[PDB]
Amino acid sequence: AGNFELEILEISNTNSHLLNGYCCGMPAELRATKTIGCSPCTTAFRLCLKEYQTTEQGASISTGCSFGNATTKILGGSSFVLSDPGVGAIVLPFTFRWTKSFTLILQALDMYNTSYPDAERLIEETSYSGVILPSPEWKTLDHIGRNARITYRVRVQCAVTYYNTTCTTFCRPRDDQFGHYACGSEGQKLCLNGWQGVNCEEAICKAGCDPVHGKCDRPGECECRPGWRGPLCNECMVYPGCKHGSCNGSAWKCVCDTNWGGILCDQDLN
Numbered sequence: 001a002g003n004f005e006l007e008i009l010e011i012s013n014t015n016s017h018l019l020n021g022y023c024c025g026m027p028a029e030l031r032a033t034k035t036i037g038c039s040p041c042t043t044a045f046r047l048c049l050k051e052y053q054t055t056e057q058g059a060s061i062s063t064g065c066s067f068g069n070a071t072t073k074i075l076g077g078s079s080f081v082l083s084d085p086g087v088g089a090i091v092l093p094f095t096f097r098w099t100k101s102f103t104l105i106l107q108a109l110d111m112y113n114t115s116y117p118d119a120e121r122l123i124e125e126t127s128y129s130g131v132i133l134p135s136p137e138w139k140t141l142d143h144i145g146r147n148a149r150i151t152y153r154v155r156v157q158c159a160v161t162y163y164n165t166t167c168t169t170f171c172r173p174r175d176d177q178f179g180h181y182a183c184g185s186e187g188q189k190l191c192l193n194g195w196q197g198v199n200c201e202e203a204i205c206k207a208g209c210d211p212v213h214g215k216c217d218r219p220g221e222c223e224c225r226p227g228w229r230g231p232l233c234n235e236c237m238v239y240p241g242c243k244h245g246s247c248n249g250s251a252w253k254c255v256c257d258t259n260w261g262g263i264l265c266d267q268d269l270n
Ligand SMILES: *[C@@H]1O[C@H](CO)[C@@H](O[C@@H]2O[C@H](CO)[C@@H](O)[C@H](O)[C@H]2NC(C)=O)[C@H](O)[C@H]1NC(C)=O
Pocket: 164, 165, 166, 169, 186, 187, 188
């Protein structure tokens, strides 16, 4: 999941015309003003996003906008450069996996409403088909049309906690008892130094720490299980009172040396 983002950067429509060659706003004949020339446009932008299209008919908004459609607020007059493109950005959410391939249709529209909608109010129209991967980097596009020049930019970003080219790999970094890991560029758990395991919840103990009789709750340490000792927890403790004997790799035992017997190995056998 994530969003396809489009930010208008500039439109240049110096003569305040429509694509059909007429003026924006009210026809000058119907105006009761001293204004000379065309009235200014009231420009907004409509984005139609859809699957990658292999023919000219696909570059129309008549084939539908499966990936979403939106219209900005009025962003300015006939020509303007947006100092802060983010405020009027078009954000189209997508669910499941990002498609990578797409076709967009971007229209500039004169929002002068008299009989309410009409297609004569198209100022300019452009289309772009391509393949884009999730990234905060913008792709800048520039359309020098017959009537207006539109500069805009697009990007795709995964929803928060999602990664990978598909925006479906989940990762949330953790630094507590249940895990110690950062998130990689594709959502991989990157264990913090000294940790391992499925959730990077296992401390990596001191080098040489006995894997069976040693443990650690913090990296680089070696704590001994009952009846074992030494810096590496590899030395068993003999049963208290054991004389001529050893633990033989088992905690609290007294296994006799040759020619000694008894529970404490203190009986000379010969
Ligand atoms: C990023 O997306 C790709 C696309 O699926 C993942 O790579 C594929 O899937 C397996 C995982 O089971 C990878 O080991 C292979 O290298 C890829 N196989 C094919 C046929 O493309 C990749 O795993 C994703 N990254 C993460 C962290 O999930």
